[PDB]
Amino acid sequence: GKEALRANIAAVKAIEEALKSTYGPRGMDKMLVDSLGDITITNDGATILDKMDLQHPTGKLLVQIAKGQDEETADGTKTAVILAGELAKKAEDLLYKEIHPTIIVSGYKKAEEIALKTIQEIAQPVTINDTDVLRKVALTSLGSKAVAGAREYLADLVVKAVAQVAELRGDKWYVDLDNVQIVKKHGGSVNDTQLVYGIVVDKEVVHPGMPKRIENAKIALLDASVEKPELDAEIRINDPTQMHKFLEEEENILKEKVDKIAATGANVVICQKGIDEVAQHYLAKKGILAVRRAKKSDLEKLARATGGRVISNIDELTSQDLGYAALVEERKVGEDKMVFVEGAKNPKSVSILIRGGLERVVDETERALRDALGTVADVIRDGRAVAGGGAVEIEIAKRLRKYAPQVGGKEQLAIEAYANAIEGLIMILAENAGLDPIDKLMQLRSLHENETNKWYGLNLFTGNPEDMWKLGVIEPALVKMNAVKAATEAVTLVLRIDDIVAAGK
Amino acid sequence: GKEALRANIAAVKAIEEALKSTYGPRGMDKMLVDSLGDITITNDGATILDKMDLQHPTGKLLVQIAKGQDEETADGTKTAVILAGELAKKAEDLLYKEIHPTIIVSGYKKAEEIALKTIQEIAQPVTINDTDVLRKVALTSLGSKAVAGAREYLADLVVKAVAQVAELRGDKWYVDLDNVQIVKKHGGSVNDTQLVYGIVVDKHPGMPKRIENAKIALLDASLEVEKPELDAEIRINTQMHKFLEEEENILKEKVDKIAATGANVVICQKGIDEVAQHYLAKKGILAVRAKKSDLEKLARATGGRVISNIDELTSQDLGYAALVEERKVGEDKMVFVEGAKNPKSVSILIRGGLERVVDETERALRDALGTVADVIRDGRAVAGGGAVEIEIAKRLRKYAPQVGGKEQLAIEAYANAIEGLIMILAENAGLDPIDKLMQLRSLHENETNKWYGLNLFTGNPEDMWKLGVIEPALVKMNAVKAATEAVTLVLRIDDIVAAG
């Protein structure tokens, strides 16, 4: 049974070894070449674990635990898995001393609970009012990613965008990120990006003859597409003057189809099907704006943000169901055109237009932005925040070291190992920064003899212990707290296994 | 993760090694034999990277970065990729000293920013007025290419041609190269080439071949008949005989509509029906059998609009010209739309004895146009021939001490990597690289002699500016940015994982 655990532990350390390079802001990236041939370079753990497949089932479960977090932000996964790795690494050293795993687990459980407690007790509170901090958080979150052009601009836009959707529910701050629309274009600098308080539709209008500007536009959201009379009736013809009139009836059918909708009268209509090129002219004749196939995602985000309902059947329409907007417009941002539904009736209306010079590079800003949104939303929803840069881990360590003596012997060693495994993560951080890990970590914890200097962490640039909070190195209290729970979960779920009997074939 | 970086760096140095031969005016060429069998010899990096395919993805991204320069000219790509190569070469030596890559990147970033600053501060300003300089620039740009016959003539024509399109937009000089038409013929010397201030079209004997004050009708419709086959299979039962004439009357009805306004020249991008020829020739109208490119360039340059549908015609929207003519330049004939209404109207007729050789002048000319356009749009220019790099080097060497230690070494390496490029230049010239570079930088103890660079012919350090060795300040500046970009984007990778 020891070889099986050795195998599983090896499996974990393999992942830790894979990701260890990418940890920290001054980390390393990994390239991934699609079978198609498309190249994708990244350090974001979610994408790495995604594209990098594993055959070892414990690996699949491990990734399932680390990656499969409840939260929208992929931030904290790397931290969790690396920690799991370190825990397993020390665990091995505990096993070498002839300690039955259940003991190690029990010690790790105490250690995790107290880690959480230690995070709780130190976690400085933060209010949505203290906007600058939220900007610092956004900065820290998005800064770590490959793109570093105009971080301040983006972070600013992030905080401003997030603060808009937030609402008081039972005096508790609730936020729904589905309320934020996110659209992408190719070409253009990073500065050319802009937020919109209305709903943006990434499309070109169906006809040049339509009004491209409507004031106080009401929006009709129709999820309907011709009729086929072949199976209904064999279209037999032997007399040529007959069919000619048979034709016009079928156009009159379409007219009958559209007239119903023309009766109530819409200002703008959007459907998720290829628009027939005759309806264009008839809709253009009335002075109505239309759009070609937009995806259901934007339609559903349009639905709640406009104060209307999306309608499956075009015959069941009611005059209340249709959304209401203040301004609709179309414009050229960069080279291509886009549609903009500005000043929607719903107060929690937000959109963001993103742009990158290269089509593959703009995708990084997406993955960098999503986390920058979520991470801040998680600061808002929680109401606590903590200075990263190693200011946390060492406190957990010193805590567990001070607590370990008075837990009884065999757990104590597991707890101490836990503390060392927590500490070693900062060393991993420093390794990636090119500095001496030991020297710096010891320097750090040696500076924590004073409780005032609790926020002191390593700056990977100066290479010197400095106050992380003042330097704008803040992170969410929760996202870093969950990493410990997922990591402990994983390691315990590795040490809890004795053998595998998987069914091949 | 070290082996992956070694592989990528190797991948870069492979490209550097491929191109290193072709760098500089006195460089080497590379032959490329098409699968068809056609042979193509060239040194132009774009074509080399084009025809030479790479399987290594980092290579594809590398070429994507180097080629993927914002500007119209392929000039500067070689410079960039070679520099990237040198940077990687020194980087290796930095890694051998146990320096984590992020440090190297940080140092290279500082080095790049300061390189740009150093280019900015020294870059002599240049105005469109100082035409001779622009000629010297054109010369330097086009001279490096395989063809060296009548460089002065061409450069002159280039500068004259470019200066015509330039316009003041918000007191800032804007230029659009789409305004320049470029047509090619086979056979004839290099001197027989000429520019035209009107629009040249590279294309019935009974039509008037000369029209005064011609109005040009731009018809993007098939002048061919309409096909009643799919419409109606016609069964023969003297009836069909008239069925014929109706169908000619259709064409007459088609043309008469267009004959309403009364235009003197018509052009369409479809095979012209041989009955419309006689009817159009009967009126005394000139016609032609042409690509949409020239039509779109004709559109804006004549003061008219290209017409999609022949039924929607208006009496405005046909272009206006002063003179139209046709002539034999060399063996074949060409059409010339001279004295267009739009002021920014330009065309150029190019000719080479051999059909494959005239294509080189094209690739040599495009860059010679862009390069000068980039001098105009920017408003700065710098003497090449190594006068730049050594200053960057000395700058970074003087700046490196006061940046902190571990960055300082990366910066110094950067400076050495910048310097080594001139050595590469000298290697291709057959001279001793070290001796000459050191000779150069040793002459820069005096700032007056800042423009001193190597002459590849005399082999002696001389003032490059006075010898007409000038280049655009921007195109050489972008190379550093793309090169740094690439190298950093190589050192930023730790491992690759392909799917399936």
Add this chain to the structure above:
Amino acid sequence: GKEALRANIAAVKAIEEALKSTYGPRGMDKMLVDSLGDITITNDGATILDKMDLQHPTGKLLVQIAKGQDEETADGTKTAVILAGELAKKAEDLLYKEIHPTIIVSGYKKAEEIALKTIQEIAQPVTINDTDVLRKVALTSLGSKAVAGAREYLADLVVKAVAQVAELRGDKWYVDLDNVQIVKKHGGSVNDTQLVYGIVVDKEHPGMPKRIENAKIALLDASLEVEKPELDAEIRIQMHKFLEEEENILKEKVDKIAATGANVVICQKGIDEVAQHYLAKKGILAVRRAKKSDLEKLARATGGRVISNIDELTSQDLGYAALVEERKVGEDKMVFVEGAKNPKSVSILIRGGLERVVDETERALRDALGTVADVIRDGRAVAGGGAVEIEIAKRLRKYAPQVGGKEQLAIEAYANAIEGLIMILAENAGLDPIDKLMQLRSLHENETNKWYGLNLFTGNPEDMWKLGVIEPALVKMNAVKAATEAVTLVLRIDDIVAAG
């Protein structure tokens, strides 16, 4: 001819690699097991190169150059050979750039001359008066060795001892270390050691006076044994009287010497046991075989002459002393000739608990004597700990630009090779070499902080001069000359041809 140079350079780097561990105060030691079986641990380069034999002739010449330093102290040899190593290491990198060796040599020559100049210009003057500094120097010199017990005591005794022998010759301070006597005993602490201003004889009849006042010393370099009549005459057995004649011969031998009447006699031969009683009968002190070394040191220090023949004696030749005594220092007894007539009279008694350990203090003391003597004779001293090398480096880096190109690179390489030595120092101290060196040179932007060097204990750049880290200006200066000598004498060789 390239492979021969590669081999020789390899040969040098091998030695550098051998010694690199032992460099600096916080260095490493090396154990050496004699063929006899006796073990000897040491870091002192002289002993390492001694006991470690090399077959490669260039190695023998190399050690011959490094060891073969003009000066009394073995200090500076390691520094020299390591520097030679670094120079060769960079030289390799210069050769890789296709630079003919003579160029490298020329550059290294300029670099060496300017290194010497740079040492001259910065070298703070020091006078014999500023005794505390001399103590700091002694400390620095002796401190690096294995023994660290009671360094202050020893250094103090060193300075006091050396200052006594120094004499004004043409107003220039001359010192002769042959004037200092050095004797050793086994067992006893390091504190139990003491200096004596008279001449100490390390030796043991009980009937003789062991204390004489104002003793005149007779230096007899003749066998006090009988003369052998065996070869002269095989005697057949009267004999009883034949005996007494032969005692009367000894009496006749001694009486002659008893003429002047000296109080102490010393000879370097086993003393006949009959002369003992006759000499003891007069009330004279004698000693058993002492070595000629102490006799020659006794000769000049007592104001007398050593006598080859006992028949040529004169009443003036004999030395004069104020006090003679014998005493038990530790377990064994020793003879002490105190208050000699010659003013430059010095002796030192050294003692270690272990017989092998006391030998280290010897080798540590000799250098501590010489090193200070070299500060006195020169009149200059310099703060070690890296405060020197970085200045040489910055100097050569600032000077290199204006020497012409191909030399400039050799000079820069020299500077880097000088710098790298401190890194080697820091490596042995367990700290990061690069970081610390860069930290050092970055602190030298201010000239005031010129003496800043690395402290191997705090790990921080600090003023070496104030911390008592001073060394002789000359001994460190000669190392550069011997190192350059060696490296140039390696790069000057193209091939070797032996007689097989």
